[PDB]
Design a protein around this ligand. Sequence first.
Ligand SMILES: [Zn+2]
Ligand SMILES: [Zn+2]
Lengths: 147, 125, 151, 147, 138, 152
Amino acid sequence: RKLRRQMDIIVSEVSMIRDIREREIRIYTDAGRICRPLLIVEKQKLLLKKRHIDQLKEREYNNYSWQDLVASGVVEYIDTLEEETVMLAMTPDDLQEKEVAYCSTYTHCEIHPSMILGVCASIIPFPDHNQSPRNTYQSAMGKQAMG
Amino acid sequence: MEPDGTYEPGFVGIRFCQECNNMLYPKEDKENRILLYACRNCDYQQEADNSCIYVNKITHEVDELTQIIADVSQDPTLPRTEDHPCQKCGHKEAVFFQSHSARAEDAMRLYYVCTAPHCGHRWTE
Amino acid sequence: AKQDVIEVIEKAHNNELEPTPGNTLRQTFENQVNRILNDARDKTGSSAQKSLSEYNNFKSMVVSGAKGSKINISQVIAVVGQQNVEGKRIPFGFKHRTLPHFIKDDYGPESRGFVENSYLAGLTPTEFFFHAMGGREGLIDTAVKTAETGY
Amino acid sequence: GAKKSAIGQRIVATLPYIKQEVPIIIVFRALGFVSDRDILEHIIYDFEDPEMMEMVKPSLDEAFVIQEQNVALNFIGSRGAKPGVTKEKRIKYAKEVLQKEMLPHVGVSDFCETKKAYFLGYMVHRLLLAALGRRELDDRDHYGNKR
Amino acid sequence: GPSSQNVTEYVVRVPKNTTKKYNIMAFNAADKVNFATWNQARLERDLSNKPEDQPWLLRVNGKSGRKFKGIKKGGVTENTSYYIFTQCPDGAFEAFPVHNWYNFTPLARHRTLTAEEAEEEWERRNKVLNHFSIMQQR
Amino acid sequence: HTTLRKVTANTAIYYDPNPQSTVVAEDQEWVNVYYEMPDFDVARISPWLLRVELDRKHMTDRKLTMEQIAEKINAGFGDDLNCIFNDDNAEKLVLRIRIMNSDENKMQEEEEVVDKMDDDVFLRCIESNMLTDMTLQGIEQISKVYMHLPQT
Ligand SMILES: [Zn+2]
Ligand SMILES: [Zn+2]
């Protein structure tokens, strides 16, 4: 993993999973796996610090980029098979307050929870105050509108 | 000679043929009235060690004693309980989980694996 | 209600619990937690029904018998309630979990189904997704049932 | 009939371009590992558990009719191909199928014929685990198992 | 002594070209082979049923002695190398290349059940109904 | 529909051709209990021993007796299945089974048309049939459920 954070093997590519109770290590580098970016947390706290943010503000006149952000190793790519074995905090807030609230073994954190939505579902505002199939009819109709 | 107790004689399959390296089957000596084990594909024969040749079911070897390797303690998605004292090591922070598997023993009984050294000890409560 | 569920989990882990006749221990545990979360839901719904002022437009549509039912008022005002697929609580789609956000083996009402919030308060992210699972059952059933009755 | 009271362990194998189901043990014979201890080593590298040993045993019992690689090859040839009293060609063609057609991801030549034997054996092991039930039955629609 | 404290240091040589190819002969430990009880051996390529690609045939002592089959490993190494470190009468080390890796396995002196007869047919009839007698009728 | 398979904790097959010196020294007094049981053809009956252990909890629910089970199996299979049983005065319950043969005719005439499979192997088919087919108080085929209800 340390090598992956350092990019001696391609992030977006290699998936690497250990199934402890079976003593197996599966690694995947085939095309076609669905994966998403997540923040790394370490020693019960987030590894990304606000100084990385100040470089991102700096991008308005600097070469610093999302790829540099991946090069800090503060974010990782996680496919669905690997996502099964991570302990994933919902939001920096929850990972912070924690003491005896739930657990302290987290390994990743969500860059923002509303990202679980697909393209058309994001147009619809307060989607969580709606009854769930109501959101599905809007995703069809929004795609149906003109402009 | 009592109703209470246990019986784990340690079943035996392999002690395969030494001459051709194949599986042994029980067989009779009607002349000595003694069990023998013979390879079917050769003349090799050898005396048995136990009078048992086969067993089936056990109503519950609950089989908590094995399978679950101590390494399971490393998994971050498994809960750390503050419930203390690995009965062996003077340290808390047991990892626990229920049962797993499909014969999951309808049991809901927690299985505890200490994660500290000075043991690697498994126990149930 | 939530504290009482934790009491039932503790009774189950302690192995102090015994099965009801004609059923297994999981089915009994599941029957018991389901009885607690529904009873919680109905008590709180009945509370919300009690609080409605008589001027309220919402109470006038249900009481007239124009559209929607008493249960809709509950969900809007008090609590959405349990989510469920094929009848039972949200299955462990992952290895012994529902979402990676939870810890392995968490039968507690939130990690497995039951949403605390009302449609007015908004659903937390996980609550939101489990709700969409329960809403999908309703979408699929409409399409499948439509074909079969047709035949 | 009175075979042994419970056929629920007679493990067979489909293979590509084979007109008839064959028991896994023939394939192992065809890989050349005549030694029953060796086949048992490929199937389950923990012969310490009596229950696994009993689970395979009736599949071993079936194996006795064929006890050499060539004839076992003549079995797979005739069970798989069009009729051909040539015997030896039936063996060579079948030899090439085992080389080329079966688990091709594990290899495509003689020089990696051993590697295939472990992997086929791993499937029987992976199957026996489920058959003991100490192993979950694998979902039909888990996204980790999609491309 | 070595049981308490010891240090040794020997130069390592590599000859520019060996006068012979160096190969590996591996056995299963389960066969517990002891060369102490070998007195003669023959080693020849099985070739008649169809050379340097062909499997090995190992024939120990006389015809009645044990016979083994030697199978060639696909390659010595795929990204490395294997070398033999040997002690020389001068007190140095000498290192030799591996040219081939061969797997050697046991074979029965006389077993042979054969399926060519009608064993396959008996299988059609197989209700697990016999076992010893078929071995006798042979 | 309760099958013997539901009640059974475990089964074991032993080679014990000498009851008077049984392979389980602890089992030895029950053999003392049975010596008047056809002592002449113990030289004729088979030497293979089947031993079964039963769950006390299943046995309590079905409120059975060991003599009911023994009478059920003997009746079901026939005279060939020679049964004896342990004392009721224990929390555990075990049953010891041997097979009798056809006695007089087994003198090896032509070749004894059985094709000479081992008698034990015949015993596993006995145990198979014994688990699945035996229907103590299992008066029918209603799977295995039965749920009692009080209606007000
Ligand atoms: Zn042998
Ligand atoms: Zn400990």
